[PDB]
Amino acid sequence: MFEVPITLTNRKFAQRRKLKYQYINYISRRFDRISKKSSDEERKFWKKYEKPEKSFEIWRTVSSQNKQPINKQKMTYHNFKKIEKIPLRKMEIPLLHCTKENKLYFQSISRGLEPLKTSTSEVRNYRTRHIVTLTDLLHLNVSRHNWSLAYKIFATLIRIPGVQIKSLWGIGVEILDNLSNSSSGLDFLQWMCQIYSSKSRFVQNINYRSIVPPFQTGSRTHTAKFAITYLWSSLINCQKSMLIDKISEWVLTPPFMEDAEVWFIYASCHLLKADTLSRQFVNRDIKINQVIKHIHYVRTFLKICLDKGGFAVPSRLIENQLKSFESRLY
Amino acid sequence: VERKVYPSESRQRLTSYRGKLLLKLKWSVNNGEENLFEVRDCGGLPVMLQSNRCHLNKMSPYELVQHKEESDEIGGYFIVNGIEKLIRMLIVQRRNHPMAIIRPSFANRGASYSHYGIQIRSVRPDQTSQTNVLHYLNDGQVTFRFSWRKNEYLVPVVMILKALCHTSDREIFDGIIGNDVKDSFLTDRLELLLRGFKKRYPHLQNRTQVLQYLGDKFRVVFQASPDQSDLEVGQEVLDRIVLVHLGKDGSQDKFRMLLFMIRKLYSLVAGECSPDNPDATQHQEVLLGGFLYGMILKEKIDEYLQNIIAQVRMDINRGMAINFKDKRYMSRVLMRVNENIGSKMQYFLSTGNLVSQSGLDLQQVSGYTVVAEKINFYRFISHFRMVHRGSFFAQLKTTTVRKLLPESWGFLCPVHTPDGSPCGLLNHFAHKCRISTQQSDVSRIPSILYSLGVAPASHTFAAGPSLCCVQIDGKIIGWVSHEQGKIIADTLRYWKVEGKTPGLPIDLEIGYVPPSTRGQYPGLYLFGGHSRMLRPVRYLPLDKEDIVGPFEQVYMNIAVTPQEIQNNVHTH
Amino acid sequence: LGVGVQGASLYCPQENYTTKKQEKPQWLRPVDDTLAEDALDLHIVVKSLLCDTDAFFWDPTVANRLDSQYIQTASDLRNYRDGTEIIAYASGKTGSVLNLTRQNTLHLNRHNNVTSIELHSPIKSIKIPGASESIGRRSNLVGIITENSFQIFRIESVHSRSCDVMVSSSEPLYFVEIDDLQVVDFAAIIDIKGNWSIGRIPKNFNNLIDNLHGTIFDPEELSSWKRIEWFSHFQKILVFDRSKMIEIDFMNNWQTEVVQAKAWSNIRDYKRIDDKNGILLTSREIIIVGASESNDPVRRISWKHDLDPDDTTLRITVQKVKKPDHILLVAFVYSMRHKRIYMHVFSHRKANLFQSLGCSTVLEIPGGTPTGIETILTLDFELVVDFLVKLRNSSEVYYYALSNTVDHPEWASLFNNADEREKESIGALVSQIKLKERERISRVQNLIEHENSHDEDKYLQDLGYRLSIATNELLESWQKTKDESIHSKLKNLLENSDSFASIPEFSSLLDQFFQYYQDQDVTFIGFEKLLHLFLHEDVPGLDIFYNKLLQCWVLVSPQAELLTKEIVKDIIWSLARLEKPSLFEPIQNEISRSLSGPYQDIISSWDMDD
Amino acid sequence: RQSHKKFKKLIGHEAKLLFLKSFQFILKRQIRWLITEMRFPKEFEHVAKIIWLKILKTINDQPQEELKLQLHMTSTISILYLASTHLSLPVYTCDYIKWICTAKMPYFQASEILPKSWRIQLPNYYVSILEGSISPFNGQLYNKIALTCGMIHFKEFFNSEISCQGLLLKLVMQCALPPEFYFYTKQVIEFEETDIRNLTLWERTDERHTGRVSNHAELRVLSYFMLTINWMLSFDRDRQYPLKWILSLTESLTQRTTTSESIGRNIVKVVYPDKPTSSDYFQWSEEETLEFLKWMEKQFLPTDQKIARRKLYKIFPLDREANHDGEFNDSTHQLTFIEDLQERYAKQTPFFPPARKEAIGRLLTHIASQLLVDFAISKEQLKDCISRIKNACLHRMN
Amino acid sequence: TLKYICAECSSKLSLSRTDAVRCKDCGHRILLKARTKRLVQFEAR
DNA sequence: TGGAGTACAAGTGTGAGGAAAAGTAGTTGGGAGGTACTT
DNA sequence: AAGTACCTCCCAACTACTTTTCCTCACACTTGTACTCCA
């Protein structure tokens, strides 16, 4: 039922989804000469858009320069029955050497009738068949508040050859919520960003199967979601350590200047460092030239994200916390 | 994947302990209306052990055994293909202080050129060296001198003095004429310097017009771009060459120092100022390893910009792609240009050759780095403590550059130097000679001198050896009497070693020069900058530990044992 | 106001973390990590009842076929009858005709004067929009969708003494443009295949599409999925599909492409929550709670969540709960393929800084997949809530309430036929079995009498006698003709072999006969270790092989013994394979295949390498 | 450079013997195990070679050019099936269609660990026949049986002995009934047959069609329990099975237990999605699942950039990180197969019509679809199984 | 048996031909040779 | 009782598709850099 | 020879549509062999 980590190709289903997207390739070149006047056959469709690289969808904020007036030419029976007369006269030539349901699959989707038949649930391979049932069971007691068992489903899941990148890292909360004799959970995202430490450019043009980019690859202009999660995993775990002067040195090495938030979490590694140390046990020259640094760090680490892209902060009382840290010393 | 390499591993492999050089570029175009940011790779350059950038930095001796080094690891050197090498320190002239050299090796340059002159070495705040020699002529016409790439240029001084701030010629004149009209050696030598220029350049009246001519003849040897007018070339000459202690926003203050490098010079050709000896450990400083290494790394990314442009100059030979908002055409360029700064920097650390298509301000191009041998532990520690006087001075067999000199007291060891050919050129530092690396803060000190009896520079209109010119780092700011700065050299010392303001550092040297009959030029000279030689002494009133340079120590009476402290003489 | 955002969107997917920090060190947890602490929460259904009533595909244009929402009539404005709860549900042969008071349970009205109003063009939409929350009164009319036209009702003049609800209807205009209209919502406002419109709905009950409009048609929206709302009451509409958002002010000229989502999402609902600022989206694997901007209220993209499952039929309903410090939001995604729900707990605040708490799941009736579910908004940390149900292949409208603290049609029409021609035929066959069940009920009883007795001591050596002679016939049956190269019957006695009652002897007499052939030409097999597949467990001896068959049917057998006794002895003569020859009959057959099978066929018959 | 490289998809005839070489060595692995745990004797192994020695001749009688040897993974099931119905074993194909969904004998993924030397010289178009491609569905095990007893005379030369006293007796113990049902079905099988006793198996030599007469010997025995399950409590004046007994008759049997046969029954529901309530895995308990997750510990014995995943092994240990349930825990605390019988008989302790015929019809929903999962057929192929049993008995008594 | 030493993780792994010059318990490159029982003789001077 | 008309016993005939690993191959990340061109 | 011409020197992201050709059956044509209103 859940979104599965299986890389499996099928003969009859990879035809019929080519036979799906090539049906777009004749209903969109008719509409080129409807909205204007009035050798692989999939790659033309993907170059018609821009791949997101941020989330599941590519977005734009609204009250912007993205504006255009609405078409008022109504679309009716005299223009809709003619957008699909030219494909079915010519896209019926693969329909006579395909399988007997690649006719069935294709006629139904022009007329509503979304499939009850999802592909990887009857596949009965006995090895990608064991994966499907275990994934519903994986989320089951997680959504029922019982962590002794769903923690122990996962180790059996990651010894089956065929599992993929999605289920690896996002539900590592089962170590986060063991806590009695735990593995501490932080050394997990160390290794997960170790061997997957690619700085490859976002390839943007492959025919995307078996994965989705915006959670699990290390492409540029927005870094890995298995990378910035490690910082937020460790930093509140650094606040629970009461290693601040050992953790701001781990932003010191990577040159992730392809993003904005990774400097704001670095705009608090030296903020909270100046929380305990800006008391100094006074109630006396030694930490005065240490506190007075550890705010000016934050003064151009909060600014350095204001130099970067999208990160909207309430800049009135964030500064008022920072100004008041040096009023502690007076 | 990207794993953590340790310098134990780079010794086994016999490879160089390199760190990859990130270098992002700003390919902007069309009055900067399109802007491209390309963090591009430039090869690995070797990195110093126990630097910031080596992994051994904040590392326990217990953990140095965990990663297989000696428990008392020295560091501070390079591993160049297994051979442990380091950049030798060299002795160069003190920054930002106009020396008063006499030199018979000026008479080679032509007839009527004298033997005297003023030499300054203004460093830039990014450690770049630049010498502005100021000669003297029998004719009276003082000729400024500098070097831009590999050549030697001569200009009349008033052409600069007209160009620095917007002066009339009497504003130039009475600028020099502070007092001492009645001296017939000021008021007559000064005439031909003004009379000749009005005769030589009658058609160059004001500063906007003198920059029309100065950026004209120095246009194409500076390789400036055709969008820049002749004044904007000339302003860039005035911001790249003459007195680069400030650069821009100091074109008033760069004027007030050339009024000081002439009134010194006229107080030399009469002989009221005895000439400074550059060997004497008081006008010479230390050129460190990294500060040299941070100049050649600036030079090699100046030879990288000019090669990208040379590639586009190889694209004007085609009509191939005139496409400068194009993304891929920039990649078409830089996948062809030699962007390997890897073995361009390591080649400096292998052979010792200081290759430069531009050219530094130093005079030799070899022997900059050696082999840190390991034949015992005494030999290996003394590489880091050695300093070489300079590779040119092996020519001069006059032993003045080789002799033990009294200003080496506490800075250079009188004993520890080898015998044989470099016996004297290869003398080491002392047990406590600690060197300033960062500079200090000077945003507080001028507010303290004006709080004392110092009149400011602009309001005053005075000069001469008979007053005391107060300077900080080659920035003339004041004028007082000789008994005034005689107290300020005690007053600033109390205000320093006690806890008054964090703006006053303790590495600051207070070089008060007392006035003397035909001796060194009197003045009160402060330096706080990079690359000085400092050692700890014990200051007797308010008894604290004090820091004293080799320029203060020429005029102090520092006792040795407290059995031998006399009265009214020893402050330290 | 929130600190960790981007502006394109605002992230918190399932169970990983959040990305923000307010940093308020005032002794009260100086961090606002969204995964907040609470006690455990589990939802318990309350079973009740409310009322009564191609093969590999399922259509998107069918959305709703039942409704019950607090909508008020026209006549209760001067009277203080504060809001009504009326019923409307589809009925008929294929569901075309259309026809309460929350006392303790949710049930049909008490004097059942429902009007089964006749509709000759069938039902695919039973839905009201309601009104806005800050206008002063409720709406009083509902427009639905028929397969031929577009009808308009009116909720006027309901009473109390008769519990009667009538409507006054406007005549529907048919499809002048013959395209299937998708969803109606008011907020003759329509969504036909191709285009949209706005209409001034009339004000009489006895007796217009405005003169500016536009289209919505897309070629590469492969489904016919559409759904429409309005945005924030100021002349702005929202037209959706599986693909994008169409925001039109029909007075201005401004089209907006915010949700560019033909890439990896499939929008399966769009729902306007009653607070007009926070509007929810529940498309493909996404759960967006995108709010409104205060500068220009056109859209804010706010706190969103992923949806982990991979279902394509997810509807949604969202019920607010107004508690004195936070504002609750849920999400019911129910399937016409399966039973699972997947929900959230949100807490909307005033300064637009709102978090989530966790996810939780409930299931349904096993027989049927839920096809229609609506909340009960109730006149507007003990997480109690309630909702109605309706399922596919289940036309029985139950009631359930989530508090905090089935035979198939392939069976019934076949078995127990109405044949009078053969009524007593099987009817005698239930007395044919007892004619031999009780023929064989007393022969065992005489064996209950004789237990190791003397006239079956007659039998037991005769059982040795007639099972010792007729073995060498079948051991000299194939000695003359052993060269076969081209069996074990053991039914040689013919008395009954069923008139002797001893468990420890007849096993140990056949096993006594096995050792009698310690010579060749016969191979015997065992029973203590071969015969275990009934018991699913070890058999050390045959006394306790039978005893687990004897300690299992004590009461349910007729007096525990007589049917149990001839179970195992039957299996003894059903496992009567004891007369295969010795090894020299298979092995010389194995060499005729190894040698007439040529030099390719040696290694073809080859075990023994690992 | 070609001297180092071999095994390159090019083997002409020896590769056609590779599946004739590999598929007896894996056969050697399968029945040697059946003596070890499934307790079948020395006469279970000696039988199963000549069965394989005349299945080579089944291909060798066809000509060598364009031979297209028709075999499957169910071939080693079907030559094991001949070591069952000739050997007079009480076994039924429930005990082979389910114990491969527990995968006790090495049937699934017989390429991965079983040969250890005969993988690399395989062309990749017989690779879908040597390993665990799919599971046999909708009677696919019952269709290779037509290839088995059919071309060579398994009748005449040997005996087709579904021990018909057993599947009746097996279904007695499968669902906790009074043992009068063991003899109730006796005069039902013996009334729809010509030459009444000792049914035989369907063979095939000419056709390509599944049996619409449904002449499989075991499949007919499966239908024979399906009307006598309806008779004794609705066609009954005797009313011996009482009226309070009906409530704990169906729903007690439709209640999840945790025996070693009922946990292993659940994976048939996992592998086969087709039948309803095959997705009933959501309603497990803790020790019902740790047995399933230690059922994985017999799944995983068949089923330089590798030391990185060693750290994934290291940070996720299969055993618990502190005090698992192995050493200092229960010796004998598992509920057995002689318990869920006897507990329900302790539950159905009472012993001494429209509200009855509907309340017996609940039992028709359970056990006539409990038959469906224990053999993995479809309910529309249950309808081919029914429609030749009742009308012919309607045709034979008249 | 001829084996070698991983310099990094200190794990004695042998080396056949047509193999990577690597470690296999860690992923290290530089790898050093161990000694076995072999007769060497010395004067005690 | 002899003769039909629709329900139906009973033999053999057509093509046409799911298995999924198996290794090769679809554009731009990639991989480096002095040798190779007659205007 | 005089500084271009700029052609490439050149591997290969995750699989891209091929891909090795093997193998399970589907889905109804045939006219009695059955059970029957007019004749």
Author numbering:
A (entry chain R): 1 to 38, 121 to 324, 345 to 385, 397 to 443
B (entry chain B): 117 to 688
C (entry chain S): 16 to 68, 170 to 215, 219 to 306, 316 to 335, 343 to 515, 531 to 555, 569 to 649, 656 to 779
D (entry chain Q): 86 to 388, 405 to 453, 469 to 514
E (entry chain L): 26 to 70
Text of the article:
Transcription of pre-ribosomal RNA initiates by binding of RNA polymerase I (Pol I) to Rrn3, which stabilizes its monomeric form. Subsequently, Pol I and Rrn3 are recruited to the core promoter by the upstream activating factor (UAF), TATA-binding protein (TBP) and core factor to form the Pol I pre-initiation complex (PIC). Here, we present cryo-electron microscopy (cryo-EM) reconstructions of several Pol I ICs, including two CCs, two spontaneously formed OC intermediates and two OCs varying between 2.7 to 3.7 Å resolution.
To assemble Pol I ICs, we used a double-stranded DNA scaffold containing the Saccharomyces cerevisae core rDNA promoter from bp −50 to +20 (with +1 denoting the TSS) to prepare the Pol I CC, and a similar transcription scaffold with the same sequence but containing a 15-nucleotide (nt) mismatch (bp −10 to +5) to prepare an artificially induced Pol I OC. Nevertheless, we obtained a CC reconstruction (CC1) at 3.7 Å resolution. The Pol I-Rrn3 complex is recruited to the promoter already bound by CF to form the Pol I CC1 where CF is in a distal position (compared to Pol I ITC). At this stage, the DML/expander and A12.2C are present in the active site, which stabilize the Pol I open cleft conformation and allows Pol I to accommodate dsDNA through interactions with the clamp coiled-coil. In Pol I CC1 (a), the CF is bound to upstream DNA in a distal position from Pol I-Rrn3. At this stage, the B-finger of Rrn7 and the acidic loop of Rrn3 are not yet resolved, the cleft is open and the DNA-mimicking loop (red) is present in the active site. CF and upstream DNA bound by CF pivot around the TSS region, which is held in the same place relative to Pol I-Rrn3 in CC1 and CC2. We therefore cannot exclude that CC1 and CC2 are rather two snapshots of a continuous movement of the CF-upstream DNA module with respect to Pol I than two distinct CC1 and CC2 states.
